[PDB]
């Protein structure tokens, strides 16, 4: 009759080590690669 | 903790944390005394 929408970890180890530049660090690695050279 | 986004402040952190400082910034022309090389490289 009606639909509402309402608002309602070890996996981090599998990705904080395999790496895919997933954090704020990137915002900085990019800036350094853009400026420091 | 993060190093500053601004490169110069990041260098100031490099000094303060002693991760890199000017005393490590040395090369052969400054080390084996090749004082002549100043006259060759840039011309």
Q: Is A13 on the interface with B (CB under 8 A)?
A: no
CA distance B32 to B28: 5
Distance between CA B36 and CA B39 in Å, rounded?
6
Chain B touched by A24 (CB under 8 Å): yes
Go through B4-32 and write b for each residue having 16 or more CB atoms within 10 A of its CB, e for each that does not: eeeeeebbeebeeeeeeeeeeeeeeeeee
Report d(CA A37, CA A29) in Å as an integer: 12
Residue B7 near residue A35, CB atoms below 8 Å = yes
In chain A, which residue's Cα lies nearest the Cα of B2?
A: A25
Give CA–CA dist B16/B10, Å, rounded.
Answer: 10
Q: How far is CA A14 from each of CA A9, A17, A21, A26, B16, rounded to the nearest angstrom?
A: 10, 6, 13, 19, 34
Is B37 exposed, middle or buried, given 0-12, 13-18 or 19+ CB atoms closer than 10 A?
middle
Report yes or no: A35 at the B interface, CB cutoff 8 Å: yes
Question: A18 — phi, psi (to 5°)?
Answer: -75, -35
Method: cryo-EM
């Amino acid at each position: 009759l009606v639909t509402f929408i309402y608002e309602k970890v070890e996996q981090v180890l599998e990705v904080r080590s395999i790496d895919s530049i997933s954090l704020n660090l990137e915002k900085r690695i990019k800036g350094w690669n853009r400026c420091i050279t | 903790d993060w190093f500053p986004e601004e490169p110069f402040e990041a260098f100031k952190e490099m000094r303060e944390r002693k991760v890199f400082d000017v005393s490590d910034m040395y090369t052969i022309a400054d080390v084996w005394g090749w004082t002549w090389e100043k006259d060759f490289k840039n011309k």
